[PDB]
């Protein structure tokens, strides 16, 4: 009973972590990462000037 509850806990957590990482890959495509870099560099230049 202890081993079964441990295995079920671990399987539920790994399923949750897998779906999070799949959303992150769907979010951050190479084209968007390039745009996010341009936005970052424009913001950092603004923060430094101010």
């Amino acid at each position: 009973n202890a081993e079964y509850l441990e295995a079920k806990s671990n399987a539920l957590f790994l399923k949750l972590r897998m779906e999070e990482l799949q959303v992150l890959t769907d979010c951050y495509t190479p084209e968007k990462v390039l745009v996010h870099r341009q936005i970052r560099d424009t913001l950092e230049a603004g923060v430094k000037k101010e």
Binding site: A2, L5, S9, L12, F13, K15, L16, E19
Partner: protein, 50 residues
């Protein structure tokens, strides 16, 4: 001697006097609590996947 051995073994097997103790009460509580927490984690996992 027979009366003493019977009494000592009975008191160990029936600590509340009326129920045969098969599982350690502390462990039985932890099984119920882990069961409940795992049912909550399963609900959160199903909701996010939905």
């Amino acid at each position: 001697k027979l009366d003493s051995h019977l009494k000592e073994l009975r008191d160990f097997m029936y600590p509340e006097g009326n129920t045969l103790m098969l599982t350690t009460p502390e462990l039985s509580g932890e099984f119920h609590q882990l069961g409940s927490q795992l049912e909550k984690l399963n609900h959160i996992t199903v909701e996010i996947l939905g």
